[PDB]
Structure formats: C-alpha cells, structure tokens
Design a binder for these strands. Sequence first.
RNA 1: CCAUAGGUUAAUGAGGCGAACCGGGGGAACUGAAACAUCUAAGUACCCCGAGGAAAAGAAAUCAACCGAGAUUCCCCCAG
RNA 2: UUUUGUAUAAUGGGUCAGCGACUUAUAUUCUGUAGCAAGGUUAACCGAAUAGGGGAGCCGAAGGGAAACCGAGUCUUAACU
RNA 3: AGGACCGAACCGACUAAUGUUGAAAAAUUAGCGGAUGACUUGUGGCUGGGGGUGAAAGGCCAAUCAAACCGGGAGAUAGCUGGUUCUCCCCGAAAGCUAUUUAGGUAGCGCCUCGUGAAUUCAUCUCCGGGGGUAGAGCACUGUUUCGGCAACCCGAUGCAAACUGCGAAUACCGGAGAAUGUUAUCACGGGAGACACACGGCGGGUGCUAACGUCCGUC
RNA 4: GUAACGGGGCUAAACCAUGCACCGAAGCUGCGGCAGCGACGCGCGUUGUUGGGUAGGGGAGCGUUCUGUAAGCCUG
RNA 5: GUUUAUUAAAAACACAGCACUGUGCAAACACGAAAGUGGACGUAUACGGUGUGACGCCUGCCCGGUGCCGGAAGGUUAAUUGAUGGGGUUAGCGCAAGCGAAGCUCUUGAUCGAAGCCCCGGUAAACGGCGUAAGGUAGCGAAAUUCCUUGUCGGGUAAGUUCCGACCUGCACGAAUGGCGUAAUGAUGGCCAGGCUGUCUCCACCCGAGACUCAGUGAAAUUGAACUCGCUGUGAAGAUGCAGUGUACCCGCGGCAAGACGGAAAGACCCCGUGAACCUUUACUAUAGCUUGACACUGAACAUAUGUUCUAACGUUGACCCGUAAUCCGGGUUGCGGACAGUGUCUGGUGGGUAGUUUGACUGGGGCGGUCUCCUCCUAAAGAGUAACGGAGGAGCACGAAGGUUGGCUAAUCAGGUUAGUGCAAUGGCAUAAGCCAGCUUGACUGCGAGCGUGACGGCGCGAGCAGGUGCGAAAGCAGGUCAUAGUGAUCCGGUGGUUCUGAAUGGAAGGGCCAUC
RNA 6: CGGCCGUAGCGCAGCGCCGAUGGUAGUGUGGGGUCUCCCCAUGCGAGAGUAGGGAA
Lengths: 48, 51, 64, 78
Amino acid sequence: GFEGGQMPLYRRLPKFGFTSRKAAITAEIRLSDLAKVEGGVVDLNTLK
Amino acid sequence: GIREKIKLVSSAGTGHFYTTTKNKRTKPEKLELKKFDPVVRQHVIYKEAKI
Amino acid sequence: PKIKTVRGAAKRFKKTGKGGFKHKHANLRHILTKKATKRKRHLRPKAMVSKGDLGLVIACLPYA
Amino acid sequence: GSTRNGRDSEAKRLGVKRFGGESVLAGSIIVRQRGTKFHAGANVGCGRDHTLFAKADGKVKFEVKGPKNRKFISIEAE
RNA sequence: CCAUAGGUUAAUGAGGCGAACCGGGGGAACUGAAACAUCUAAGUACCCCGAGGAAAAGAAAUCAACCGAGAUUCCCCCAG
RNA sequence: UUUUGUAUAAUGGGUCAGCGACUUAUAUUCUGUAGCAAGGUUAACCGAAUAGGGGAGCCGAAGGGAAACCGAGUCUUAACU
RNA sequence: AGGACCGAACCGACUAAUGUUGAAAAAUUAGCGGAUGACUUGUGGCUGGGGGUGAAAGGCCAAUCAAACCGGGAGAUAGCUGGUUCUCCCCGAAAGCUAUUUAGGUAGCGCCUCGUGAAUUCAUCUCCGGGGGUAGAGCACUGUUUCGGCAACCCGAUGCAAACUGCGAAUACCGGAGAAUGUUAUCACGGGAGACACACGGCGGGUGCUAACGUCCGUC
RNA sequence: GUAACGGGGCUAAACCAUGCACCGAAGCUGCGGCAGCGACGCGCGUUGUUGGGUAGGGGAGCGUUCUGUAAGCCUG
RNA sequence: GUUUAUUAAAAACACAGCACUGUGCAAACACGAAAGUGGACGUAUACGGUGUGACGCCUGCCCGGUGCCGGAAGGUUAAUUGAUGGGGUUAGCGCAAGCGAAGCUCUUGAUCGAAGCCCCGGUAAACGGCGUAAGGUAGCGAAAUUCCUUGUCGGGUAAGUUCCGACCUGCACGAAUGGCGUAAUGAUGGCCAGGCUGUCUCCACCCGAGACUCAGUGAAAUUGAACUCGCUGUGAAGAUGCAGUGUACCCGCGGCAAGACGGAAAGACCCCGUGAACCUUUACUAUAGCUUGACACUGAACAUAUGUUCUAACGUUGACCCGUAAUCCGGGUUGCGGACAGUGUCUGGUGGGUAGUUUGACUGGGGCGGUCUCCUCCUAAAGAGUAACGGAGGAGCACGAAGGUUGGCUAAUCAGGUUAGUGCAAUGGCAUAAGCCAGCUUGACUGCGAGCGUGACGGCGCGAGCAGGUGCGAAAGCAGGUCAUAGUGAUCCGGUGGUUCUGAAUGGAAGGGCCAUC
RNA sequence: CGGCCGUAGCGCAGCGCCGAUGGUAGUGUGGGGUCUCCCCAUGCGAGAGUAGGGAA
Ligand SMILES: [K+]
Ligand SMILES: [K+]
Ligand SMILES: [K+]
Ligand SMILES: [K+]
Ligand SMILES: [K+]
Ligand SMILES: [K+]
Ligand SMILES: [K+]
Ligand SMILES: [K+]
Ligand SMILES: [K+]
Ligand SMILES: [K+]
Ligand SMILES: [K+]
Ligand SMILES: [K+]
Ligand SMILES: [K+]
Ligand SMILES: [K+]
Ligand SMILES: [K+]
Ligand SMILES: [K+]
Ligand SMILES: [K+]
Ligand SMILES: [K+]
Ligand SMILES: [K+]
Ligand SMILES: [K+]
Ligand SMILES: [K+]
Ligand SMILES: [K+]
Ligand SMILES: [K+]
Ligand SMILES: [K+]
Ligand SMILES: [K+]
Ligand SMILES: [K+]
Ligand SMILES: [K+]
Ligand SMILES: [K+]
Ligand SMILES: [Mg+2]
Ligand SMILES: [Mg+2]
Ligand SMILES: [Mg+2]
Ligand SMILES: [Mg+2]
Ligand SMILES: [Mg+2]
Ligand SMILES: [Mg+2]
Ligand SMILES: [Mg+2]
Ligand SMILES: [Mg+2]
Ligand SMILES: [Mg+2]
Ligand SMILES: [Mg+2]
Ligand SMILES: [Mg+2]
Ligand SMILES: [Mg+2]
Ligand SMILES: [Mg+2]
Ligand SMILES: [Mg+2]
Ligand SMILES: [Mg+2]
Ligand SMILES: [Mg+2]
Ligand SMILES: [Mg+2]
Ligand SMILES: [Mg+2]
Ligand SMILES: [Mg+2]
Ligand SMILES: [Mg+2]
Ligand SMILES: [Mg+2]
Ligand SMILES: [Mg+2]
Ligand SMILES: [Mg+2]
Ligand SMILES: [Mg+2]
Ligand SMILES: [Mg+2]
Ligand SMILES: [Mg+2]
Ligand SMILES: [Mg+2]
Ligand SMILES: [Mg+2]
Ligand SMILES: [Mg+2]
Ligand SMILES: [Mg+2]
Ligand SMILES: [Mg+2]
Ligand SMILES: [Mg+2]
Ligand SMILES: [Mg+2]
Ligand SMILES: [Mg+2]
Ligand SMILES: [Mg+2]
Ligand SMILES: [Mg+2]
Ligand SMILES: [Mg+2]
Ligand SMILES: [Mg+2]
Ligand SMILES: [Mg+2]
Ligand SMILES: [Mg+2]
Ligand SMILES: [Mg+2]
Ligand SMILES: [Mg+2]
Ligand SMILES: [Mg+2]
Ligand SMILES: [Mg+2]
Ligand SMILES: [Mg+2]
Ligand SMILES: [Mg+2]
Ligand SMILES: [Mg+2]
Ligand SMILES: [Mg+2]
Ligand SMILES: [Mg+2]
Ligand SMILES: [Mg+2]
Ligand SMILES: [Mg+2]
Ligand SMILES: [Mg+2]
Ligand SMILES: [Mg+2]
Ligand SMILES: [Mg+2]
Ligand SMILES: [Mg+2]
Ligand SMILES: [Mg+2]
Ligand SMILES: [Mg+2]
Ligand SMILES: [Mg+2]
Ligand SMILES: [Mg+2]
Ligand SMILES: [Mg+2]
Ligand SMILES: [Mg+2]
Ligand SMILES: [Mg+2]
Ligand SMILES: [Mg+2]
Ligand SMILES: [Mg+2]
Ligand SMILES: [Mg+2]
Ligand SMILES: [Mg+2]
Ligand SMILES: [Mg+2]
Ligand SMILES: [Mg+2]
Ligand SMILES: [Mg+2]
Ligand SMILES: [Mg+2]
Ligand SMILES: [Mg+2]
Ligand SMILES: [Mg+2]
Ligand SMILES: [Mg+2]
Ligand SMILES: [Mg+2]
Ligand SMILES: [Mg+2]
Ligand SMILES: [Mg+2]
C-alpha cells in the first residue's frame, strides 16, 4: 500500500459501514440442498 | 471570510435544513426563503438558524 | 505465518461479485456548505476501484 | 538574485474535441472554450462554461452564419 | 518485681553444584513506524529468587442463551 | 565495476588452489500439470500401518445492500423513463 | 629563615638535529627547567563507566576515551557502496509524466516481456470533411517610431512587437472513404519486469554573450 | 618539437565544370550450413520471412554431489 | 607552581589576597532507593558555592529585561468536595400516544481549596546594559582590541608594513566574565645594540660512521598483464600503450628525482543520508530532585476553620541503666520536642540536573535570499500537452441580490459607434447583449441522469432528459446560482440534528451505521 | 417574414468593400554551403500591392 509518501488509497478514502453480527448466524439454502436432508422435512436441525 | 455559515431550517418540523452563508454585519435581518422540503415533498418557508 | 490483512483497507473496500472492489467517495466528510448539491449527490453512491489502483488494494486485502 | 515571477496556472485542455464530420452521441462535448468563440447552432447546447455539446446523435458541422460572420456549430441529425 | 531479652548445651535440618524445561521478583535498547514522542520491538534479551521430575493449572461466585454445557492442561479448527 | 560516456591517469584484483552470495518455513495469488467434479478436500487425532479411519473445518455452486433485509435480483429514491 | 640562589643525583621536557619499513608504536645526541618542596620515590590501599578522577588539557581511567574493556540483545539498522559463479535460442526497454520530509529512494501511469481474447483493429498513401492564429505579413486595434502638412488631435509618408492582429500559410492533428502492403503491425485483460542520473547531433525556441563539450523545453 | 594537408611530397597530386572507369563495408548478390516465426499441404515437407543487443521478460539445455532403479552393471 | 602521557608549557590552570552568597549544627552541601558516610570528632575568626586574582591607586551610572531576596491587599489557579440541572432504566398510571415515584445509573460541575504566576518592592564584586532602565565616569587608547591601515607625527635605519614615543578619527577599550600602573620573576610574545661567529657572500680542506667492492646471513611497502621511448595531435577533456611522426643495437652498475595523475589511508574539506554521537538552550516531550496542598500514620481539653494548652502516637545525631569485653543496635528509665516534624498515596508549581528526540524541500555546490496551493497571459513550434531561481499579473472572496424571470434600455469621447461597461487579475466573450433600469420572486430546488471532457489515482468538470414540487411569463418558454475561467484542504478523530438500520441472555439504553452538517 | 451577411455599407466612385495574373515571403521532404544565416531539387505557396470589380 505504500505509494512513496503520497497519502495512500486506503487512507485518502473514508471508512464506511459496520459489521452485522446477525449476518454471521444467517445462511442461504439452495433448492438443490432440499433433497440432501434425511426424511424430506427441511428445518434448521435437519440442515445441520 | 466575513460571511458566516448559517442554516435555513424547515418550518414543516421535519428537521430538514439547507446551509448557506450570510454577511451578518450588513444584513442582520434573518433570512427567510420558500424552499423544497424533501421530507414532506413541498415548498415551505425556511428560516435562518445558527449552523 | 498467515498474511495479515491491512485492517484499514478492510474498513474502506468491499469485494464485489466479479472481484472488483467498491469504496466510498472522498470529499463528503465536511466543508459541505460550499459544495454544490450536484457534486455532493454524485459523491454519495459507492464507486469501483480503478484499474491502476486494484493492485494496491489486492495487496492490502489477501483474504477479500 | 531573486525573481518576482515563477507562477502559472494549470492548462485547461480547452479547444475542439470533435471536428467537422465526426459522428457524435447526444451529450458529447464538441468544444471547450472561454466565452462563445463558437456559438451553438441546431441540435447543440451551450453550457454554463460555454461548453458546446450535442443535443442529438449526428455529425458535427461548422458554419459561418449571420450578419457578424460568427462561427456556429450544429449537429446534422444522422 | 514476676518476667522477657540475652547466654550455654543437645537433637534435627539447611548450605554448595548442575545444560534445558517450569513458577515467580525486576526488566532494556537497537529496530519498525520509511523522521519521531503515543505505539512497536516485548514482558523479548538480561539480572534475581524458588521448585520438580516435570512444573504450573485445576473441580465454576465458568460459559451459554431461555436450548444447554459441566475442573485443569495440550493439539487441530473457528480466523488473520 | 560504475557511468551520458572509460585505453583511461576512475574502482577492484600480486598469482594459484580451496571456500564464498536469491535460501528455508508458513501464508497468499497466478501459470503449468495430475485427480475428482457441482462438487473438491480433509486437520488434529486413531491406526504397527505412506493403507484405512477421522469431513471438525475450508473453498466453491448468489448476489445486492452500511444494515435490518430482500434474493436472480438487489440497492438507490416518494417512484424510476 | 626561605614554595631563596648556583649546581649533580632525582623529577621534568623549552630548542635543534637525527630517526620516521626506527635501536625505540614517542627515543637518541647537544643544549634546557625544577632540584627543602604546592618536591620526589618504594610498598600496600580506596574511588568504576553517564561513573570515577581532573592546579581544567575534554586531560587521564592498562599502547583504547566527547562516554573504557569483555560478553550478550546481535545476523541492530544500512532508501548507501561493493559483489553475485554453467550454456544456447526468442523478444527487448527507460532515463518521461504525476505524487512524495521528495529530489541518487518509492508509487500509479508511459515504454519491455509472456499468456489469452477480439473487430479491417492499426500504419503508410490518395481523395474527402474539419478547427486553427504559428511562419510570413501587416499597422485598423494595443503599444512603440521617424519625417512632413495641419506642440495635441487629425491627414499623408516610414519602420518595429513573445505577452499587437481589420490578414494568414506549409506542416501537424482529429474524423470519413478507398486500394495495395505489412508474420495483428491494433486494442483489452491477466503473470513477470526493468526504468523514473541521460548524452550528443539536426530543426524550432527560453536562458546565457544566437559564449560554453553551458543550461532548460519541444521534435526527429 | 616541424606541429594549422595525418606524413611524404604536389603547381596539380589545388580549385571549378562535364563525363566515363575503377577502389571501397560484417550493406547487397553468389555458394554451403544452423535456428525462430507465419502460411500452405501431408512429426515430416513446400513456401514466405526473420535471427545486433544492456536492464529486463520468455524458452530450452549442459555438468556436479546425493536417493531410487542397483544383491543390477563396470572394475586388480 | 600546574597542564593537553604521544605535534600546544602558554598570555591557559592554580595561587596568596579580595568580594558576593549560602550555612545555627541532625549545618549548608555531597555520595547514597535506604541505613548511613563525608563536611567535622569542625561550629560563623567555621564550613560550602561562585566570581576576581600579589601589591599600589581604584572600582563610576542603570533594577526596564532575566535571576535572586522580601511582601501579601487583589486577580487567577490542583487534587479534593459534589450543590444544581439534564439523561437511561421502570413500579405505576394512561385504549394507545405518552407520562412517570423510589432505587440504581450516565452526565453536569455550584461551593471549598496551597504554593506558583500576575501583582508590589529590593538587589549589579547577580546574568547583564551604559544614545532610554541609564546613556561609558576615572583611567587607558591604531591596543593580545583599529576594518579603513603600512592612520599621522616623532625616534631609531642608507632604507623600518615590525618596534618605541605621541596624537584620538575607540569600525568595535573601560573599571572584580575587573580598569590603569607595577619592583621582582619567566625554556613567555615583539624590537634594538655590543660581543661572536661557515647563518650568509661562497664555499674549501680534513677526521670519523654509512654509501661503493668482496665473503656470510637476508627483509619491506607494491604488483591486472607488459615486448614499459620522444614529440605534436586525439581522446572520459593533462597518453609508454590511440594517430601521425621522430629517434632508438642487447644487458648491467653508481647516481638524480621531472613523470608513471608514483606508494601509504574506501578525502578529515564540500555536499548528500528523512545516518551517528556528544554539547547548548526561554526547541518539544518527559523525568530525578526541590517545593505546595489534601488524605493516611494522627490524639485530648479549652477558647474564639484558626489559636492556646496538654500527652499518649511519633522524633531525639541530650543524659543515665542493661544486654556487654561494644563508641553499632535493641530494651529500659528520664529530659527535650510533640500531633508539629517526618514518611506513603494523590496533587499544582519548579525542574538542560538528567533523558529521548526534532530542527523540510527546491537550489546551475551548499548557505543567505526567494519559492512551495490555486487563477490569467506569454514562452508553447496555428489540435491537447510541454521546462527553467524564464517574462508579466492576480486569488485564499463578494452577493438574498450583484441570484431567477418578465418587460424595457444602450456606452466612451468630443458628431461618434462600444474607443464604454463587466463586484475584483488577465485572457476569451458579450447588442438576441453576458452591459444598464424596473416589476414579481427563491430554480442559490430535492431525487436522478443518456452521454461526454479532463486526470496515474484520489478526484474535478460539462450535460440534455426523467420524477416530484416551485418562480417568472398572455404564451412559446426560461430557471438545479452569478459572462466564463481563481476564492481552496484528503483521511482520521470527534461535535450537532435527523433516522428504531444495528442493539453481545431478553426488553430497553449506551455505542456503532446511514443521511444532513460542523 | 426570411435567405444572404459590405460587389450587399456609407456619402453626395468621394470613400469603405471585393479582387486577379505575375513576382515575392514562408514552408513539408531530400540534399548542400562560407552555417547567428542561406542555397539547390521537388511539393505546397501567402500577406501587402497592382490591373480590375463594384451603387447587391
Ligand atoms: K466529445
Ligand atoms: K524506541
Ligand atoms: K526508517
Ligand atoms: K562517476
Ligand atoms: K582515485
Ligand atoms: K506459489
Ligand atoms: K492447480
Ligand atoms: K437494476
Ligand atoms: K559509558
Ligand atoms: K513509477
Ligand atoms: K503486462
Ligand atoms: K534536441
Ligand atoms: K614552561
Ligand atoms: K530586576
Ligand atoms: K429515575
Ligand atoms: K576594538
Ligand atoms: K563575573
Ligand atoms: K588590581
Ligand atoms: K619580556
Ligand atoms: K604513434
Ligand atoms: K621521479
Ligand atoms: K522520650
Ligand atoms: K505532621
Ligand atoms: K531540565
Ligand atoms: K539550475
Ligand atoms: K555552477
Ligand atoms: K434579478
Ligand atoms: K422540473
Ligand atoms: Mg458525515
Ligand atoms: Mg494558461
Ligand atoms: Mg452572426
Ligand atoms: Mg537448595
Ligand atoms: Mg523509525
Ligand atoms: Mg503441582
Ligand atoms: Mg437450566
Ligand atoms: Mg562522471
Ligand atoms: Mg574508447
Ligand atoms: Mg582520462
Ligand atoms: Mg598507465
Ligand atoms: Mg585503471
Ligand atoms: Mg568508488
Ligand atoms: Mg589495487
Ligand atoms: Mg450474499
Ligand atoms: Mg628554590
Ligand atoms: Mg608532565
Ligand atoms: Mg637530554
Ligand atoms: Mg630559577
Ligand atoms: Mg638549580
Ligand atoms: Mg576545547
Ligand atoms: Mg591510554
Ligand atoms: Mg553514548
Ligand atoms: Mg533484536
Ligand atoms: Mg550486520
Ligand atoms: Mg531484435
Ligand atoms: Mg508529506
Ligand atoms: Mg513574425
Ligand atoms: Mg527521481
Ligand atoms: Mg530525471
Ligand atoms: Mg532531457
Ligand atoms: Mg538549438
Ligand atoms: Mg550538455
Ligand atoms: Mg550549445
Ligand atoms: Mg617552435
Ligand atoms: Mg588524409
Ligand atoms: Mg566484403
Ligand atoms: Mg548481410
Ligand atoms: Mg541482422
Ligand atoms: Mg539476439
Ligand atoms: Mg546412486
Ligand atoms: Mg615557572
Ligand atoms: Mg603534547
Ligand atoms: Mg611540548
Ligand atoms: Mg553527620
Ligand atoms: Mg581570571
Ligand atoms: Mg496563593
Ligand atoms: Mg591592522
Ligand atoms: Mg603603524
Ligand atoms: Mg636590522
Ligand atoms: Mg616613521
Ligand atoms: Mg605604540
Ligand atoms: Mg575587555
Ligand atoms: Mg561595576
Ligand atoms: Mg564586571
Ligand atoms: Mg586580570
Ligand atoms: Mg653482500
Ligand atoms: Mg597529450
Ligand atoms: Mg639505475
Ligand atoms: Mg634522492
Ligand atoms: Mg597516490
Ligand atoms: Mg569515500
Ligand atoms: Mg539534551
Ligand atoms: Mg531511538
Ligand atoms: Mg537525531
Ligand atoms: Mg537541500
Ligand atoms: Mg497549443
Ligand atoms: Mg503545434
Ligand atoms: Mg515531454
Ligand atoms: Mg443578469
Ligand atoms: Mg451578475
Ligand atoms: Mg466573474
Ligand atoms: Mg485516533
Ligand atoms: Mg441486549
Ligand atoms: Mg448484556
Ligand atoms: Mg493575395
């Protein structure tokens, strides 16, 4: 990131946003995954 | 500069404001202008307040 | 050992679907009264890192 | 043993961007200038800094017109 | 003054040495930050005390999240 | 060797022999190559086992948004031509 | 009597010559100062490194002193200098711009290379469409200039200009069309760079004295 | 130290004009050979063309010590 | 007397003498985390520090600055204390909106509060100054000081930049960082004379030790390789080695040093490196020490938070007793102090005593000066761009109208035709005016934005059109600031308003995000 | 109401305005000299002025 002393790109640009703790405990399931559970009943425990 | 920053605050109670500058020495009369308030989506009176 | 992320870069850039990076524009922190609404409006959306700078960003973010 | 000069401003990259007969998209800048050295003709707009730009797709046309023999830029809709 | 301090003798033990590892008492600077003071190097080097065949830790005033786990230690993940 | 440029009167070497300088570990990206393929691969560990077990994990098959959230869309905006 | 006098021992070290790979890492020779004193000397002791000791020169502290020596942190750091070892084949730079506590460093871009992909993509020439304000020229304008007519203005005559223009090329550049030619010569993306001290010569110039093998640009 | 044709020397062996000869390079051509790249046809042909190089990028190799192949093979 | 052991012996240091100043003894002061020890088994006729430097004659004026000393009216001011106000939460009350006790909690900071500083005085043998604090006295003066300068005059010499004596025009003397003298002293500096001489005119001869030859022993620095000439030219610009040319049989020995940019030491000057060290200070930041107050160790009476008194903590480097052969230490008795002193934690001040560091770049070397961002013109070679410590000027704003729009209007100059005007440089523009006047106004709108320009990038610029809502106009229309081009500052950190986007068990909240803004 | 934008406008051909031909200046490319500046070959070729036009 050093650019010879010019304020580098990762410091001349502003920080943004925050990190969601909820996003880390949220998943997405594909339709292809629904057949992969045992018993044809898809819930959080059967996916795990 | 001599000109000081001011806010123009919406009369609609939305808390929406514009900012501009003013020569307070020549023009101490408070600035009042009809401006578009984007919260209520209407032109309403805006009145000078401190920045 | 594991490469260390440049943590300041991780706060400024996010990787997009085709592997570019989005960032927030400079010049919208303060000294805003003198700036035209048009100028500020165009600075509000996120922008893509330019071709010349991608090398510098990628070096900083090995785990992006 | 010192100078009171040594100053200049950045060059502004004025001048003609699209010459006669060039095909342009609407919005394209044709000339950057100070004042109206060139005037806006048909399908050309004049911006706040006297930039002439295409308001239609077509070919750039330079013409001398009117009683002052002034230079006009038009777009021939093409 | 009673005494207590002090004195003498006997018994038992200690003392000193040793490469690392271990617990504790103290604790740099060069260096990096393209200078430098916060920060870093690093609780590292070094000095000191003490132990053992290992030491230390250890049986929840611990986590968890409304479901539950069940002392300590070590390894792989979690994750740059 | 260094330089714009060295027969240079710039540098280095008296000669010979021997030694003497891009490595190693771990991460990461790209190329080649091999395996398997919408999957791929296991770590510690168990195992006398270069076997076999172990899929905890990791990467990939979805993105958009600061985020809640929505999802082949999503964000922006009261709403998009 | 005496930090008294002359002068050996003893303690010093003013001058000169020698010596300077010495006889000697400070001496020798001839002279020189002190020589009962704040003298000199033997033995032993004490003061320890940001510390000692110093009638003070930063002097001395084991041939070491503006911070001893030895070991350790330790392979400190070194944008600096040096050096970098067998062979052949293909391609082949740069010494520029921008930024920089930057200027002999470094970063992005430019230029090299390798890979992948893609359009007649690119070049030359011819024809066509364009904008110029340079060279030259000119003097209405801005200034400057001489003569004459009427010391102003005005009229006639004469010049001069990077920051003058009622004129204005060649070239160059942008775009379009068409052949021929050229190992895609073009552009995009990706792997790997190097380079960012340039030199002279020609042409156009600033600077300098139309001085410099001078200096600073443009272009070959 | 001649020391202001490189020297000898030159009255042209100088200069100007015109012309034809010749010399002259690692340029071009000839003959033989090697290699890179692209075409065109079947790893070989035909054809075109290229091959000066520092930094530097790419490609392909030589040789050295050691492990397997090797209780093999060579060696009094 | 002393000194740079090993290039400086001196005018430097010391010195007796002088002065200032501190110090009452458990002295000041110094070495020590401390105990202690030195000072001193001394006690103000003493001891420490500082300056001056025998002696003689002397030592003038200035207290504004910086120190030091003294003062304490007033101002300001630390820890501490926590008044008051504002928030969070929720018992409860409200259909909800919302309100909201107590408690707990986040924040606010009234009052209290010492030294210091400001303030008021003093002090120069304090640091210093001597035309305003005061203007240099006495003495001295071209000087260890005088640039101009070899000043001028006198002396000495044939001739004197030195010397001696004067003069005063002191570039830039001057009174204890002492002034002027001064017998004696000095391996001290300068000048003159007699004697003396190989110092010299100008060298000669001689005696010895080397050098030379023979025998024995036997180094060194240096060294790319050498078949290692002159000259003129050339050339990384001063040639044995290149060109041209001249000269030259091969090889020693004694000699000499003009050249081999000879040998020796990775130039010590100079610059550079975001190198080092040590030194300085009213550079920055710290900090030992010194000092202030609060709380602790720390108590009791009485009087009006201060004061007196008390003893029992605590101190004792007073006396005596014992452990004990002991001048340490401890215990005991007693006297004297006494809640003081002193120490711990906290706290303000002071703090080159000590420590870590910083102290820019460009530059026809560096420094000094100038410059550093932005705008306009020229250089700039008729597209863009284009350098110099090249040539010339400007900006760091202004304006609720000087902006929008509708309607109207036209200048300088003395007829003319923009020679005027433009909020501010210059350039390009401007009459359909962009110039001038008036009416109504807020488009100096919010969300967006085809497309394009300009940048390495961060960015910056131009923009029709779309949605919402608006102004002016009868209407076509025009308006997202201003004739255009300067009027500017990334990121971080934080502030304010809005927005339940997030909210670490859960509901909230804090904090964070997002939008606006500082 | 326009096109056009001085041959078109003024004044009352007198001006403005337009304007050849030829020559000159400059200049791209190549070559040369005595090189601060020029010349030759070839291509391009002004400005000013001259003849002339001209009362749209
Ligand atoms: K354009
Ligand atoms: K440090
Ligand atoms: K550094
Ligand atoms: K050099
Ligand atoms: K040298
Ligand atoms: K790799
Ligand atoms: K692979
Ligand atoms: K979309
Ligand atoms: K030391
Ligand atoms: K670069
Ligand atoms: K590349
Ligand atoms: K050139
Ligand atoms: K002496
Ligand atoms: K004072
Ligand atoms: K409450
Ligand atoms: K003086
Ligand atoms: K003094
Ligand atoms: K005296
Ligand atoms: K004397
Ligand atoms: K020769
Ligand atoms: K010699
Ligand atoms: K007592
Ligand atoms: K007390
Ligand atoms: K200090
Ligand atoms: K220069
Ligand atoms: K120079
Ligand atoms: K207006
Ligand atoms: K609108
Ligand atoms: Mg903000
Ligand atoms: Mg300009
Ligand atoms: Mg016109
Ligand atoms: Mg033991
Ligand atoms: Mg550093
Ligand atoms: Mg244990
Ligand atoms: Mg339970
Ligand atoms: Mg050189
Ligand atoms: Mg050569
Ligand atoms: Mg040379
Ligand atoms: Mg030589
Ligand atoms: Mg050499
Ligand atoms: Mg060198
Ligand atoms: Mg050498
Ligand atoms: Mg996703
Ligand atoms: Mg004597
Ligand atoms: Mg001595
Ligand atoms: Mg002697
Ligand atoms: Mg004597
Ligand atoms: Mg004597
Ligand atoms: Mg000294
Ligand atoms: Mg020594
Ligand atoms: Mg040191
Ligand atoms: Mg280290
Ligand atoms: Mg090293
Ligand atoms: Mg090649
Ligand atoms: Mg900077
Ligand atoms: Mg000219
Ligand atoms: Mg550079
Ligand atoms: Mg350069
Ligand atoms: Mg150059
Ligand atoms: Mg030239
Ligand atoms: Mg040069
Ligand atoms: Mg020259
Ligand atoms: Mg001669
Ligand atoms: Mg010849
Ligand atoms: Mg040949
Ligand atoms: Mg050939
Ligand atoms: Mg070739
Ligand atoms: Mg080659
Ligand atoms: Mg083998
Ligand atoms: Mg003496
Ligand atoms: Mg000496
Ligand atoms: Mg001496
Ligand atoms: Mg004592
Ligand atoms: Mg003295
Ligand atoms: Mg006080
Ligand atoms: Mg003098
Ligand atoms: Mg004199
Ligand atoms: Mg004499
Ligand atoms: Mg005289
Ligand atoms: Mg005199
Ligand atoms: Mg004096
Ligand atoms: Mg005095
Ligand atoms: Mg004095
Ligand atoms: Mg004196
Ligand atoms: Mg011999
Ligand atoms: Mg020569
Ligand atoms: Mg000889
Ligand atoms: Mg000799
Ligand atoms: Mg030498
Ligand atoms: Mg050197
Ligand atoms: Mg210091
Ligand atoms: Mg340091
Ligand atoms: Mg430093
Ligand atoms: Mg510099
Ligand atoms: Mg240009
Ligand atoms: Mg040009
Ligand atoms: Mg350039
Ligand atoms: Mg207006
Ligand atoms: Mg205006
Ligand atoms: Mg303006
Ligand atoms: Mg911070
Ligand atoms: Mg919660
Ligand atoms: Mg919680
Ligand atoms: Mg003509």
